[PDB]
Amino acid sequence: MRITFNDVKTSLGITESYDIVNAIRNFKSYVPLATANNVAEVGAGILINQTVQNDFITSLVDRIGLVVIRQVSLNNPLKKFKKGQIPLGRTIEEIYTDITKEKQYDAEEAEQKVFEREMPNVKTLFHERNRQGFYHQTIQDDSLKTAFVSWGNFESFVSSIINAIYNSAEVDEYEYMKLLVDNYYSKGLFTTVKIDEPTSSTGALTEFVKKMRATARKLTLPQGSRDWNSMAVRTRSYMEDLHLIIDADLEAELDVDVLAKAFNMNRTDFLGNVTVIDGFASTGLEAVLVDKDWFMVYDNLHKMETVRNPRGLYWNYYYHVWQTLSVSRFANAVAFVSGDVPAVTQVIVSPNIAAVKQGGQQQFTAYVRATNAKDHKVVWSVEGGSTGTAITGDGLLSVSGNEDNQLTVKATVDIGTEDKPKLVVGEAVVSIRPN
Amino acid sequence: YTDITKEKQYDAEEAEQKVFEREMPNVKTLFHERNRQGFYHQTIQDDSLK
Amino acid sequence: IIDADLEAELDVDVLAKAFNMNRTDFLGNVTVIDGFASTGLEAVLVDKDW
Amino acid sequence: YTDITKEKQYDAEEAEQKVFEREMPNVKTLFHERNRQGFYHQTIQDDSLK
């Protein structure tokens, strides 16, 4: 947020003053082409007439500012979530191959079936969120005339015209990240861990620290857990790839050490794996622990445009940044809430979307994200409406012949009482193909 | 000093009505200064030059 | 070779101080699994060439 | 596909505040999908056909 001439001098392949503006570029016989100590001559050449003045200021602002801001935005502390331009044909579809055990080697078993497929790749759709905005600013003719006294004034002017846009964009990036985290939590796709007001006392603080350490150790199990993630798909995470987004008050109450001792890092390599924000503004969310690949951001474009007001003798330059943010549905993501969260958070059906023939069968299993140690019972419903289309209590659904309608399997859990105005359901879309 | 602000949402319908608009004043202020001027001075003898 | 729950309960330090290593070269000599499923087996300490 | 537009009357006095007004084009779109997948199967038992 304190960009100086050193940053632009490193971003560009030039030293101090330059004539690349009048190299790209009649303009030739108006300004001297020397880069000597003289500044009055170049100032007079620039300010001789409005056409040359406007052309020079447009080239400078647009090209130089765009290059510098694009180069400096790619090296901010939160640059590990930043990707390049969006690839062509991304198809917004995410495919994950579920990991399973091996099949025993048996010639008698192998000789009967050799062309048989294995299993569907449990496809899903990306969770997207796009942003597009502008900042814009103004520069006066007075503080362009009073900028050619010395070569230091020119670089101070350039740094001043870049700094405002850069700092505003950098500040807004954190707010957009917090908004994305809030939206994901409100969607209910996190896996929840209950804590009890870590800042209330000292025992709550150490209990929260121990719970975080246990959660990280369970996440980084080499064999896989499947207990986390918005869909139970048996993925495994890394001790060195987990990222923590924590509340400002919570991190202020906590210390740099012991928090890093819970992980395997030691302060220096841990401060780069934690993000600090002032309040989550979502019920009682305290700190969110996600995988490194959970959150990504692509940039559609960055553009800078200048216009001139001749009646008022000034310029307005607008900086437009358009980019999209995507959170993956397969990476691990833990909410760590301290509130009045229900006993059951979400129920997930493993087969997800499936296709079956007119007289086939399918097995659906359900995983319930229970925040307590009590076991819950799941009831199965078919909705739809037909003859012979019913699903057993263990999740086996057989499709009767002569069927045309599209049906959805539902798994329901009840955590209420005699009056139960609270239902949590999981939906699986089943398609039918004629046989 | 230029104050840090949020970003305006992209809206062509609102943009086409106003394009020469300025942004904000730059909250000018003056420095708090204090000037120091003094001397110390010392003497050297001819004996401790010989 | 230690159970996952026991490894989580134990801190990374002192366990390494029991040996002569210090964390960085100690995590390379420990394997963590989830459950042994053998009565009351907790952790097994073996030679490298075992 | 893009379609034709309308005509407006020249008005210099009203042109001084409607420079950046927008008149979106008439654009229509259509989609076509792949809808045939078949195969023909035959067998040749030439050794017995001889």
C-alpha closest to that of A165 among B26, C36, B7:
B7
Q: Which of A2, A134, A160 has the most B C-beta neighbours within 10 Å, making it the best mutation to test the interface with B?
A: A134
Resolution (A): 3.0
Please state, in angstroms and rounded to a whole number, the distance separating the CA atoms of residues A430 and A354. Answer: 5
- CA torsion sign for A210, A212, A214, A216 is negative
Q: State the count of interchain CB pairs (< 8 A) between B and D.
A: 8
List helix spans (H) across C1-50: 4-9, 15-18
Answer yes or no: are the C-beta atoms of A245 and A335 closer than 8 Å. no
Instruction: Check CB contact under 8 Å for A138 and B10.
Output: no
Nearest to C27 among A222, A261, A264 (CB): A264
- CA torsion sign for A258, A262, A265, A270 is negative
Instruction: Check CB contact under 8 Å for C8 and A221.
Output: no
If you ran DSSP here, which 8-state letter would residue A88 be given? Answer: T
Chain centroid to CA A298: 9
CA distances from A295 to A114, A251, A418, B49 (A): 40, 22, 42, 77
Which helix (H) or strand (E) segment holds residue A181: the answer is helix A151-187
Answer yes or no: are the C-beta atoms of A272 and A241 closer than 8 Å. no
Return the beta strands (E) in B1-50 as ranges: 8-9
Answer yes or no: are the C-beta atoms of A303 and A273 closer than 8 Å. no
Which helix (H) or strand (E) segment holds residue A322: the answer is strand A314-327
Please state, in angstroms and rounded to a whole number, the distance separating the CA atoms of residues A132 and A324. Answer: 9
- Neighbour count for residue A38 (Cβ, 10 Å): 11
Beta bridge partners of A276: A246
Please list, residue by residue across A255-288, b when 16 or more beta carbons sit within 10 angstroms of its beta carbon and e when fewer do.
eeeebbbbbbbeeeebeebbbebeebebeebbbb
How far apart are the two ends of chain B, measured CA to CA in Å? Answer: 60
- Residues in contact with A268: Cβ distance below 8 Å, sequence separation at least 6, in sequence order: none
Please state, in angstroms and rounded to a whole number, the distance separating the CA atoms of residues A23 and C45. Answer: 72
Please state, in angstroms and rounded to a whole number, the distance separating the CA atoms of residues D48 and D50. Answer: 5
CB-CB neighbors (< 8 A) of B10 in chain A: 132-134, 320, 322
Q: A298 to chain B, minimum CA–CA distance in Å?
A: 18
Please state, in angstroms and rounded to a whole number, the distance separating the CA atoms of residues D34 and A78. Answer: 44
Please state, in angstroms and rounded to a whole number, the distance separating the CA atoms of residues A297 and A294. Answer: 10
Answer yes or no: are the C-beta atoms of A199 and A205 closer than 8 Å. yes
If you ran DSSP here, which 8-state letter would residue A337 be given? Answer: B
Tell me which chain D residue has its CA closest to the CA of residue B20: D20
Task: Sort strands D26-27 and D2-3 into parallel, antiparallel or unpaired.
Answer: antiparallel
Q: A163 to chain B, minimum CA–CA distance in Å?
A: 9
Which A residues, 34 through 73, put their C-beta within 8 Å of a C-beta on chain C?
none
- Residues in contact with A196: Cβ distance below 8 Å, sequence separation at least 6, in sequence order: A204, A207, A208, A338
| DSSP per residue, D1-17 | -EE--------TTGGGS
Return the beta strands (E) in A217-256 as ranges: 243-247
The identity of residue C4, as a single letter, is A
CA distances from A177 to A79, A169, A237, A245, A279 (A): 12, 12, 22, 10, 13
Please state, in angstroms and rounded to a whole number, the distance separating the CA atoms of residues A320 and A137. Answer: 12
